[PDB]
RNA sequence: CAGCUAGUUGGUGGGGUAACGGCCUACCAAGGCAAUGACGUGUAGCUAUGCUGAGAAGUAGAAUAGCCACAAUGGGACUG
RNA sequence: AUUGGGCGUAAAGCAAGCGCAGGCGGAUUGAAAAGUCUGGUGUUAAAGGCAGCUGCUUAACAGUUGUAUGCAUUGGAAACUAUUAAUCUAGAGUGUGGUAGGGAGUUUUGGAAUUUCAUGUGGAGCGGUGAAAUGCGUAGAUAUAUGAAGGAACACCAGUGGCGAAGGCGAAAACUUAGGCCAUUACUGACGCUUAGGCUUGAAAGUGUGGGGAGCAAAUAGGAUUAGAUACCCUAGUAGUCCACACCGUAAACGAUAGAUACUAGCUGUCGGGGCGAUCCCCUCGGUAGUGAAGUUAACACAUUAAGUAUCUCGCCUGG
RNA sequence: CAAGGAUAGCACCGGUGAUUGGAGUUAAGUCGUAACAAGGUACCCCUACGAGAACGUGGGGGUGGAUCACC
RNA sequence: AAGAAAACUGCCGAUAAGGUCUUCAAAAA
């Protein structure tokens, strides 16, 4: 154990992905896919705290986000289910960059 | 003017027609694709330009006036990633969707649009609130 | 599937069975039609009392009983605890339970209920195996 | 559970009913329902509601409240 | 699993086709306003439900005010669907012009090869096996040469192939007949997709009647092997395999992948029509294969002939 | 007019029944070794017959078959 | 010079029951 600890250790201080949070909760709602597993991320109000349990309430409370509704339509699998919930987290679209592109006034409607 | 070389069909569903080029269309990089015109596509299209996901629509005519086809073009920023992002149609053919102004969607919390055509053509989802009013809802465009 | 199919044949949900068919009969006995009245609890019979060895990876001796419940339906039933008393003629209450060593045993001999003396020697769980207090 | 229905379908004159009405009568006809499920079987008082569910809804129709039906079983009528 | 699932290898695409009713459905114009949206009025009993307050020592609780949901009627909206009145050809068909096929049925014909019989030569084995033995043979077998009869199947051609919806189709000819590909300045003008029920076809085995029977061979007999052999081996051997007319309607009936429609890199083959004109090769339109990225998958793998992005319709699945 | 009574034959549903059929569960039994490797006769599907039994054989159908092989 | 080269088959059946074994990373003056 000690060895493997400190492996997995490094190993994800080398793939750290970088994530953005809007008042501390997920922006839009969002459907993580990977391999059989599926993820919905929904956006909470301030206060809920995370609906979360397993290995997405680890991701939500070690990514920083706090509100922040979960659930896991799939299968049961740690890894799977931090696969599907990166994925989903990692699509996400800022309400910023979207109307640059969109090239509309930064949130304005 | 401009000329094609290629026989030009449309399936019958006009919503999905368009949702399936524009999400190969997307897929693949690709820039430009035709399809046949019609009024309902014709302004479904009206809307999406003035919300700005693609940046030319093109309709032309025969010399006999009997047929006409829409070209229209994504639009691709420079590292060539689109705007588009995911369309996603509601009411299908068979079963249609039908909702009041109240439980009129929000698609992606606002940040997608919404096609519904309510009395006076196709109208965004939020000047479809400005409205009050509701009714067919075609898409979902995000 | 479809639309059109599913509005044609709509979706059936799968039935439901229960645990212990056998305590949810009640006969009126004025005109032997048997209902379909869920209870917790009923009395029963014996009509046959030994023992019998079990399924494969637990191989101990074993007591079993055989009931005739008030009403006309007849199930083993396993003699729970140490010690007995059963004799081919004694009345017992039954519950529901599930033993997984013994194959078709579906309800536990509540003891020290009607016929059945409770264990005495019992500390440790002495309400579920009948037993007032050492003190 | 694939045919069911012979006062069943319609008209005529009359009677009866608080009232319309095969509700009943005599005559004249042969229709009516049914695969979009008649008919048959089994089951059950219905609803507002109770419990559960994020929701769509599932489930039981405690108490109580609305409506219906019943008063050992099956029929008839008086009074009003 | 309408929201909210799947059917190649895990349960699940009917064997295939013709298909009525149903569902869905090209473009444009006009009307109506049945869906759809919206305004007004009525109602949806009270209690309960959610919010606020009060009263019980606060609560539980009780009271209090607020709080929807649907239906009907009326007044408007006309984008889509539905209805009706019409126009158009791009969907689908028809004709003309090119054109490839083992597509099917009926009737005739042909040659190798086996068997039997007939006639010669011939003289001791032949046959069979892991090794043998039943068996055939001086009544002259096997072999060799010629001839006759009869039944069944059609070497080579024959394929990194063709046709049909599937099952299937391969000697030659005639008659009848089905569908398909390419180009259309022609024509009708949405006549189209799917299909519960229904109808047609549907490998082989099997059935009934009447023929036929060369070879082969379930069942059966014998010889081997074996601890035993009702099996694997050998020698015999009936039904059957064949034809006509009637049924049976099942297969790993498999591409383990329903049909239709639009879009999505490329490369290598091969086949057909068309364009050029020795082949060869180039291009176009289609059919059949290999490799292969995005994309999909649990993985294997699929990948323009999808299991990819989507729609319509039907069938099917819900632990053993 | 008519509850009820008697007679009469059909219709539907239930219980039980000598005897008998298979089925699941099971103790370690008794005869083979059919399948999983080329499982020692490749396997599997439909069908007909036969045999203590798994199963054998004939006809058709598939690779969800091994070995084999090509510079 | 274009060769190849070739399989071959006797027989060969069975193996009583239930059974360990991963304790743990908290992380270390
Ligand atoms: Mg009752
Ligand atoms: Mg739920
Ligand atoms: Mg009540
Ligand atoms: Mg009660
Ligand atoms: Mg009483
Ligand atoms: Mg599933
Ligand atoms: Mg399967
Ligand atoms: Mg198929
Ligand atoms: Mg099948
Ligand atoms: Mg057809
Ligand atoms: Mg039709
Ligand atoms: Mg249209
Ligand atoms: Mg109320
Ligand atoms: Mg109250
Ligand atoms: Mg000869
Ligand atoms: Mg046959
Ligand atoms: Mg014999
Ligand atoms: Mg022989
Ligand atoms: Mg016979
Ligand atoms: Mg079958
Ligand atoms: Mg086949
Ligand atoms: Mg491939
Ligand atoms: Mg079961
Ligand atoms: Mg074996
Ligand atoms: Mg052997
Ligand atoms: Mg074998
Ligand atoms: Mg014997
Ligand atoms: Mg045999
Ligand atoms: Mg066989
Ligand atoms: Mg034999
Ligand atoms: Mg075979
Ligand atoms: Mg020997
Ligand atoms: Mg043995």
Redesign the pocket.
Same mark, same amino acid.
Do not use: C
């Given at each position: 154990?000690?060895n493997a600890?400190?492996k997995a250790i490094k190993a994800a201080h080398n793939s750290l992905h970088t994530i953005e949070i809007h008042k501390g909760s997920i922006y839009h709602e969002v459907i993580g896919?990977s391999?059989?597993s599926r993820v919905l991320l929904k956006p909470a109000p301030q206060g809920t705290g995370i609906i979360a349990g397993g290995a997405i309430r680890a991701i939500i409370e070690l990514a920083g986000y706090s509100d922040i509704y979960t659930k896991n339509l799939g299968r049961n699998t740690p890894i799977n289910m931090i696969h599907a919930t990166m994925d989903g987290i990692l699509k996400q679209l800022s309400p910023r960059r979207v109307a640059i592109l969109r090239n509309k006034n930064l949130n304005e409607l | 003017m401009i000329t094609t070389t290629?026989? #030009?069909? @449309?399936?019958?569903?006009?919503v999905? *027609?368009l949702?399936?080029?524009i999400?190969?269309?997307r897929? @693949?990089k690709?820039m430009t694709?035709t399809? #046949? @015109?019609?009024?309902?596509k014709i302004?479904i299209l009206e809307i999406l330009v003035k919300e700005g996901y693609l940046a030319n629509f093109q309709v032309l005519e025969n010399k006999?006036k009997?047929?006409? #086809?829409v070209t229209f073009n994504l639009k691709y920023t420079q590292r060539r990633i689109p705007s588009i992002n995911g369309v996603?149609?509601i009411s299908?053919? %068979?079963?249609?969707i039908?909702?009041?102004?109240?439980k009129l969607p929000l698609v992606l919390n606002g940040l997608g649009i919404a096609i519904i055509?309510?009395? *006076? %053509?196709?109208m965004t989802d939020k000047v479809a609130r400005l409205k009050? #009013?509701? %009714?067919?809802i075609l898409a979902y465009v995000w | 599937?479809?639309?059109?199919?599913?509005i044609?044949?709509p979706?059936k /949900?799968?039935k439901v069975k229960s645990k212990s068919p056998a305590l949810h009969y009640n006969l009126n006995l004025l005109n032997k039609k048997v209902?379909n009245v869920y209870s917790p609890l009923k009395r029963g019979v014996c009509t046959r009392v030994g023992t019998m060895?079990?399924? /494969?990876?637990n191989?101990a001796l074993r007591k079993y009983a055989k009931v005739r419940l008030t009403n006309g339906f007849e199930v083993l039933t396993y003699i729970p605890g140490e010690g007995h008393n059963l004799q081919e003629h004694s009345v017992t209450l039954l519950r529901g339970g599930r033993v997984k060593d013994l194959?078709?045993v579906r309800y536990h001999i509540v003891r020290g209920t009607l016929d059945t003396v409770g264990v005495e020697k019992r500390r440790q769980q002495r309400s579920a195996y009948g037993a007032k207090k050492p003190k």
């Open positions: 154990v000690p600890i400190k896919r391999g059989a | 290629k026989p #030009i069909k @449309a399936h019958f569903d006009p999905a *027609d949702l399936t080029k999400n190969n269309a897929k @693949a690709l694709v399809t #046949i @015109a019609s009024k309902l302004a006999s009997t047929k006409r #086809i996603k149609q299908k053919p %068979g079963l249609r039908y909702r009041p102004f109240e055509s309510t009395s *006076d %053509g196709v009050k #009013i509701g %009714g067919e | 599937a479809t639309i059109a199919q599913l044609r044949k979706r /949900k799968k209902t060895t079990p399924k /494969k990876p191989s194959p078709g």
